[PDB]
Design an enzyme around this catalytic site. Structure first.
Site, PDB file in Angstrom:
ATOM      1  N   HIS A 450      35.678  32.060  49.768  1.00 12.61           N
ATOM      2  CA  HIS A 450      36.253  33.237  49.129  1.00 12.61           C
ATOM      3  C   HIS A 450      35.210  34.328  48.866  1.00 12.61           C
ATOM      4  O   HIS A 450      35.385  35.485  49.269  1.00 12.61           O
ATOM      5  CB  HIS A 450      36.904  32.816  47.809  1.00 12.61           C
ATOM      6  CG  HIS A 450      37.435  33.953  46.999  1.00 12.61           C
ATOM      7  ND1 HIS A 450      38.781  34.134  46.769  1.00 12.61           N
ATOM      8  CD2 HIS A 450      36.801  34.939  46.321  1.00 12.61           C
ATOM      9  CE1 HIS A 450      38.953  35.181  45.982  1.00 12.61           C
ATOM     10  NE2 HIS A 450      37.768  35.686  45.696  1.00 12.61           N
ATOM     11  N   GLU A 451      34.124  33.968  48.188  1.00 17.16           N
ATOM     12  CA  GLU A 451      33.097  34.950  47.867  1.00 17.16           C
ATOM     13  C   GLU A 451      32.390  35.525  49.085  1.00 17.16           C
ATOM     14  O   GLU A 451      32.068  36.708  49.102  1.00 17.16           O
ATOM     15  CB  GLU A 451      32.067  34.359  46.901  1.00 17.16           C
ATOM     16  CG  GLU A 451      32.667  33.959  45.557  1.00 17.16           C
ATOM     17  CD  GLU A 451      33.251  35.137  44.793  1.00 17.16           C
ATOM     18  OE1 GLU A 451      34.041  34.898  43.859  1.00 17.16           O
ATOM     19  OE2 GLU A 451      32.920  36.300  45.114  1.00 17.16           O
ATOM     20  N   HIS A 454      34.040  38.492  50.373  1.00 16.95           N
ATOM     21  CA  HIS A 454      33.741  39.771  49.729  1.00 16.95           C
ATOM     22  C   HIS A 454      32.467  40.352  50.318  1.00 16.95           C
ATOM     23  O   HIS A 454      32.345  41.562  50.466  1.00 16.95           O
ATOM     24  CB  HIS A 454      33.541  39.611  48.219  1.00 16.95           C
ATOM     25  CG  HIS A 454      34.801  39.360  47.456  1.00 16.95           C
ATOM     26  ND1 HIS A 454      35.888  40.204  47.514  1.00 16.95           N
ATOM     27  CD2 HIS A 454      35.127  38.385  46.575  1.00 16.95           C
ATOM     28  CE1 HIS A 454      36.829  39.762  46.700  1.00 16.95           C
ATOM     29  NE2 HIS A 454      36.391  38.662  46.117  1.00 16.95           N
ATOM     30  N   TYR A 589      46.773  39.213  40.044  1.00 17.57           N
ATOM     31  CA  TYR A 589      46.367  37.944  40.639  1.00 17.57           C
ATOM     32  C   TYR A 589      47.456  37.428  41.574  1.00 17.57           C
ATOM     33  O   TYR A 589      47.180  37.060  42.714  1.00 17.57           O
ATOM     34  CB  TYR A 589      46.109  36.908  39.549  1.00 17.57           C
ATOM     35  CG  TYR A 589      44.970  37.253  38.613  1.00 17.57           C
ATOM     36  CD1 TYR A 589      45.189  37.406  37.244  1.00 17.57           C
ATOM     37  CD2 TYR A 589      43.668  37.404  39.096  1.00 17.57           C
ATOM     38  CE1 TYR A 589      44.138  37.696  36.374  1.00 17.57           C
ATOM     39  CE2 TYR A 589      42.608  37.695  38.234  1.00 17.57           C
ATOM     40  CZ  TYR A 589      42.852  37.837  36.875  1.00 17.57           C
ATOM     41  OH  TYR A 589      41.808  38.109  36.018  1.00 17.57           O
TER      42      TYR A 589
HETATM   43 ZN   LIG Z   1      37.214  37.440  44.538  1.00 18.70          ZN
END
Ligand SMILES: [Zn+2]
Length: 654
Positions: A450-451, A454, A589
């Site tokens: 996930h990170e 980014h 979210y």
């Molecule tokens: Zn995130």
């Protein structure tokens, strides 16, 4: 970038940066109408943002990673000064006047699209700050903002400073690990001290098989600062409503949502209502399972059975469902995910997906010896796209959660040349040692994937204005790309590329992979219905006037979750998000997650989870624009239609 800055240099650089930057705003703010031009006003502000952002990031980053406390403390203070400075510049009426003048003087449709967007955003930000309004309105807004700030500080501080605890005997704590029990403050009374802090709360509610203990702790945790915070919440609601009206909106939610993909409170309400209705059947199924497990357990333990799922039964039985209905032994599983193997496989997947090659810059300057610097280059031309640091292991003073920090924004410099983006990904995976490999839990692999997503958004974006660089997109869309990418950790092919038994070198057995993948749905119905209750409470408090927080929450828990709120409690009074900047945006979210599944299923699942053609379209349609295009427009291009909840529902088996 610079990383060998001392606490003294940080202090000095901050003052210098503020002086130099303020100089530009002063220049812009004092121009005469006649001298206002694209170059002298719009470009002037755009260019200074580039120089400022670069320097600002360097000064506020050390607080999260520097091993030196002096440097960390100076960085924290610099961040405060720079943040204050940012707000001060944002409220400058003199500068705003010149921006408004430029908008007047600028011939319609004569600017490049991104430049026009930048001008429109500057105009909008000023209006959302009320700079265009009458003095009396601005004075009132200023006054309300001041009060709101103070109210939010107390709401959070009250909860954070709370030191409430409940004493329990080893018998009443039945179910909790031994290492957990001895960690408690043993009272002379003989009873162990259990505080309402997370490290104590969550494990107890999920593992303690003594119903009365769960019940007592749940009541206490959800009753923290009940009287004080409920009073504060009532004031926040009223003040936010008044402020929103003074700024031209019918509700606080509508004011907040104007900048989100969702746009209006009605759009959010419809989204939440439809989702709740579609998930209802799954919720019914899950509660039936939990009620039976509770009947069975009460019978087994000789406890009374009230025939109802209580708020204090939820986490416990959901955990039981996971352990006995889906199983999957994380202990065994983690042996196949040594950090070194996950990193290699993860970087491998992203390289192939985005047409990139990552190059480790051996012996590059860093804030810690365990940090590694990589340069991302185009796979066919070798041209640099951007750079990223990986700081994966825990250490004293370092940020304790996984995150992506944009350091240098990808945009155009004053001379028109492009500045590459530079970002850093932080994680806290145990560092491998002599005879103690670092095995990652599946959730850590998920967080890692996930990170890094980014990081790729930061690097692959090609916005020209720093304001639209990287992850600077709608708050309810910024998480969508990474959540879309999480799907890779629930697919067999990608999982196999990120795994290998740390000792035997064997691949994860298909049987284990199947179970792991199946476990994704565990308790998803009740988990999401609860998130919907929270999102709806957030919306109600910021759209209604007479809405009572506790009553709204109670009503929603019964109608949507099917599990009653405990009488006497006030969960909303402990709901930090209501006073943490997320106010009126909690639905974000669910919004990003739901549409992320449309992104994944519609494009990647149909054309090939590891197909480069799709990956390149993702890079081009979703990452490349940064905040230069509305999320709705990027999604429409990527999907070929507007997004729907369909993919999300199907993934749940609905
Ligand atoms: Zn995130």
């Amino acid at each position: 970038l610079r990383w060998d800055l001392s606490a003294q240099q940080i202090e000095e650089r901050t003052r210098e940066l503020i002086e130099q930057t303020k100089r530009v705003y002063d220049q812009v703010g004092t121009q005469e109408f006649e001298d206002v031009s694209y170059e002298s006003t719009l470009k002037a502000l755009a260019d200074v943002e580039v120089t400022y952002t670069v320097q600002r990031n360097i000064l506020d980053f050390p607080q999260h990673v520097s091993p030196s406390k002096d440097i960390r403390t100076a960085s924290t203070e610099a961040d405060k000064k720079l943040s204050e400075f940012d707000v001060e510049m944002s409220m400058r009426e003199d500068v705003y006047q010149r921006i408004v003048w430029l908008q007047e003087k600028v011939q319609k449709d004569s600017l490049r699209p991104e430049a026009a967007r930048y001008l429109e955003r500057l105009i909008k930000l000023g209006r959302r700050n009320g700079l265009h309004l009458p003095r009396e309105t601005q004075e009132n807004i200023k006054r309300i903002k001041k009060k709101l700030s103070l109210l939010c500080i107390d709401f959070n501080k009250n909860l954070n400073e709370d030191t409430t605890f409940l004493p329990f005997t080893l018998q009443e704590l039945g179910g909790l690990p031994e290492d957990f029990l001895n960690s408690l403050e043993k009272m002379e009374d003989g009873k162990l001290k259990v505080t309402l802090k997370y490290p104590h709360y969550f494990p107890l509610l999920k593992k303690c098989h003594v119903p009365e203990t769960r019940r007592k702790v749940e009541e206490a945790f959800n009753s923290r600062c009940k009287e004080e915070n409920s009073a504060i919440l009532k004031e926040l609601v009223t003040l936010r409503a008044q402020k929103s009206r003074l700024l031209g909106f019918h509700t606080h939610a509508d004011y907040v949502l104007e900048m989100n993909m969702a746009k209006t409170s009605q759009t959010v309400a419809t989204f939440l209502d439809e989702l709740a209705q579609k998930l209802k059947p799954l919720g019914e199924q899950e509660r039936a399972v939990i009620l039976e497990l509770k009947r069975a357990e009460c019978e087994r333990r000789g406890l009374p059975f009230d025939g109802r799922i209580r708020a204090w039964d939820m986490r416990y039985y959901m955990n039981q469902v996971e352990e006995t209905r889906y199983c999957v032994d994380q202990n065994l599983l983690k042996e196949y995910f040594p950090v070194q193997v996950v990193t290699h496989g993860l970087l491998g997947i992203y390289q192939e997906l985005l047409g990139l090659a990552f190059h480790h810059e051996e012996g590059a300057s860093a804030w810690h010896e365990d940090v590694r610097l990589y340069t991302a280059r185009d796979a066919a031309s070798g041209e640099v796209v951007g750079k990223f640091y990986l700081d994966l292991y825990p250490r004293e003073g370092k940020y304790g959660h996984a995150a992506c920090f944009g350091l240098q924004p990808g945009c155009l410099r004053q001379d028109g040349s492009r500045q590459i983006a530079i970002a850093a990904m932080v994680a806290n995976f145990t560092k491998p040692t002599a005879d103690a490999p670092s095995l990652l839990q599946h959730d850590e692999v998920r967080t890692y994937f996930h990170e890094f997503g980014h990081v790729m958004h930061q690097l692959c974006s090609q916005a020209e204005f720093a304001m639209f660089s990287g992850t600077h997109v709608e708050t309810d869309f910024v998480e969508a790309p990474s959540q879309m990418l999480e799907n890779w950790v629930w697919e067999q092919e990608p999982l196999l590329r990120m795994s290998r038994h740390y000792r035997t070198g064997s691949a994860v057995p298909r049987e284990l992979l199947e179970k792991l993948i199946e476990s994704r749905q565990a308790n998803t119905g009740l988990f999401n219905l609860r998130q919907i209750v929270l999102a709806k409470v957030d919306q109600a408090l910021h759209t209604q006037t007479d809405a009572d927080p506790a009553e709204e929450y109670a009503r929603l828990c019964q109608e949507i979750l099917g599990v009653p709120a405990t009488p006497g409690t006030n969960m909303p009074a402990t709901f930090g998000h209501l006073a943490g900047g997320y106010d009126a945006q909690y639905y974000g979210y669910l919004w990003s997650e739901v549409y992320s599944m449309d992104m994944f299923h519609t494009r990647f699942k149909q054309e090939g989870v590891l197909n480069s053609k799709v990956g390149m379209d993702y890079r081009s349609c979703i990452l490349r624009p940064g905040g230069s295009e509305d999320a709705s427009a990027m999604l429409r291009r990527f999907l070929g239609r507007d997004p729907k909840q369909d993919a999300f529902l199907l993934s749940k088996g609905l």
